[PDB]
Structures are given as C-alpha cells and as structure tokens.
Design a protein around this ligand. Structure first.
Ligand code: GUN
Ligand code: EMC
Length: 336
C-alpha cells in the first residue's frame, strides 16, 4: 500500500498565461494533481524553445529524477526521441508526434471534430461567404483543421471559400493580431486559428466580425465575437497515463481521443447564433459524438480534383496521420 510519489514533468512551448493551448495542457496537469493527490509530484517548464534548448530542458528533467515526462509541442518531437534513447527507465509522452520507442508514446486530440462543427456555424454566420484560418506551420494537425473547417462550412454552403494565412509560429500575439487583420482586410468574416492566443478573437471583436476560441473558452476576451470554442480536456489522459506508470501497466502506443472520449468539448453558443443555426449545430454535434458523421467521410477531392475518398468510405488513419493536401475551396492570402 506504500509507494514513493511519481515525479511527473511537463514541457511547454508557450506560457501558462497564453489563455489557450498551454493554459489547457497546464489545466490537465492540475487535474492530474487533483485526481492523484500525494501519489504524484508535478513540475513544468514554460516558454521552452525548439531544438538544442528543448533537448537541454528535457535532459535536465530526466536527470532530476522525473519518471514520466510530457513534451506538449510538435516541435519537441526530435529532442524527445533523443532524450528517450538516453533515459530508458523514464516514460516519455510526446503530443502530436509520429515517433515511438519502448519508452516513448505519442498522444493527440481529434480537435478537427470540433473544427468541423465550427465550420458548420461559420457557414451560417458569414456574410461574405469567406471564412479565415490563422495557421502556424503546415503539419498534419493544422492541415486536418483547415480541411475540417472547410468541409464543415461546405456541408451548409458548398460555395464557401477558406482563406489561410501562415505566421510560422504557434504563439505570437502580435503576429496573430496582424494575421487576423489581414484575413479581415481580404474579406474573411468568421475566423479560426491553430495558434495559441486570443488575439484573433480580439481583432474580430474590434472589426465587428466573428471568431472561435481554441483549446479554452476565450469568450471573456471577445464576448461579441466568440461564437464557441473547441475546448481541450487533457486531464483524464494525463491522469490515466500517470496511473499506468505507477501501476506498471504503461506501454508505448499512439493515443487519439476526441469528443466521444471527452478530450474535445464545445463551449456554449454565442447569443447571436439564431435558432436554425443552433439546432443544426446541436444535431451535428450529437452525430459527431456518436460517429454517425466523421469529418473526413467521403466523397472528398483534393484541390487538383483527385478523389481521395469515395462516397460511403472514410479517410484511412494513414492518410489522416500524414495529411498534406487541401480540399477544394482552400486558398492562401495575398502576401504583404
Ligand atoms: N496546437 C498546437 N499548439 C502548439 N503550440 C506549441 N506546439 C503546439 C502544437 O504542437 N500544437
Ligand atoms: C481550428 C483548430 Hg484550434
């Protein structure tokens, strides 16, 4: 019945005060601490850059006696794989990665389920017929979200166009704000983002447009603009993983949880959403949870007109994992 506390560390690419992505991972850590109490001792490091700095931070946490380390950014993938080889008695969990080892697992959300529902609402609320996406880097997570936003919108209005702008960072509130201003200048009036700040929401509110929270309810930053949010609940996953390491049941695997598992939840609808739109949103949400609809159910074509998925089929897990193609109706912004 007696066992020393499990030392668990979290490595963040951003600040806990982003009120988005890192905030939600850190709420997951705090949920793990509440659920497991004295059986776990957690620590975290914020604002860890990619490459040599990340490797040095992850090594130091492994050297300090942490037995379970979560690296919560795509950009920590190669540093995590190198430190895992050097620390074969430490369990490593890497968010959104594709590299596994005996002591390295990977985990991610199916947030694109929520992004699909956002696109349904964006189609109902847009006046220009142009929706906007602030992207970080063209990795499969982000391209799945761009496509899911577009397909969700197209389920309501097949003529919808999605304009994408890239900021080449996950988190920079000044760059995110400039990117949101550019999308609105180029005719987008309902915005979503894969970056980590509420900057896009604040710009939407200032310009009288709409946007969506990402990873947390961001309505306090922009009560008029915030239609809803795709909330990320990491707490149950972090709890289960820490429990597995303590109990000796942990094994390397690829974990993907969505709305059915409670990792992805939608915030309440803005009062501006009319009853016809709200009703459709609740019906599609129920269908998403039950698996009666899937964001990448066929038929799908890419932007060259190639068939990716036939009607009555679903996109295979391999194509989801490596997604680097766009559906018809996705375009870039004019640069400068
Ligand atoms: N959404 C998202 N935000 C991040 N911020 C830093 N790394 C990531 C990542 O992998 N995904
Ligand atoms: C739109 C993906 Hg946070």
């Amino acid at each position: 019945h007696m066992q020393e506390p499990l030392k668990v560390a979290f490595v963040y690419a951003g600040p806990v005060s982003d009120a988005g992505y890192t905030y939600a991972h850190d709420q997951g850590r705090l949920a793990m601490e509440k659920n497991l109490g004295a059986k776990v001792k957690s620590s975290y490091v914020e604002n860890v850059p990619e490459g040599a700095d990340a490797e040095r931070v992850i090594r130091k946490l492994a050297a300090d006696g942490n037995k379970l380390i979560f690296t919560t950014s795509f950009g920590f993938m190669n540093p995590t794989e190198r430190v895992a080889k050097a620390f074969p008695n430490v369990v490593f969990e890497h968010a959104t990665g594709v590299k596994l080892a005996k002591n390295l697992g990977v985990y991610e959300s199916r947030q694109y389920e929520g992004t699909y529902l956002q696109g349904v609402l964006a189609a109902k609320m847009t006046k220009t017929g142009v929706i906007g996406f602030v992207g970080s880097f063209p990795v499969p997570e982000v391209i799945r979200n761009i496509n899911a936003y577009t397909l969700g919108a197209q389920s309501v209005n097949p003529k919808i166009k999605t304009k994408v702008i890239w900021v080449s960072t996950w988190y920079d509130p000044a760059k995110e704000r400039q990117a949101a201003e550019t999308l609105i200048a180029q005719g987008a009036d309902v915005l979503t983002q894969n970056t980590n700040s509420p900057a896009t929401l604040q710009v939407a509110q200032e310009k009288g447009k709409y946007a969506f929270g990402c990873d947390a309810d961001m309505s306090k930053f922009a009560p008029k603009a915030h239609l809803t949010a795709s909330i990320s609940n990491w707490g149950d996953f972090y709890t289960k993983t820490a429990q597995a390491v303590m109990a000796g049941t942990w094994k390397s695997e690829e974990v993907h949880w969505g709305m059915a598992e409670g990792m992805v939840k939608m915030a309440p609808l803005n009062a501006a959403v009319p009853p016809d739109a709200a009703k459709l949103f609740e019906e599609k949400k129920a269908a998403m949870v039950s698996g009666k609809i899937k964001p990448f159910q066929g038929p799908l074509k890419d932007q060259s007109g190639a068939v990716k998925v036939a009607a009555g089929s679903d996109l295979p897990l391999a194509s989801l994992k490596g997604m680097n193609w766009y559906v018809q109706g996705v375009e870039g912004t004019i640069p400068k």
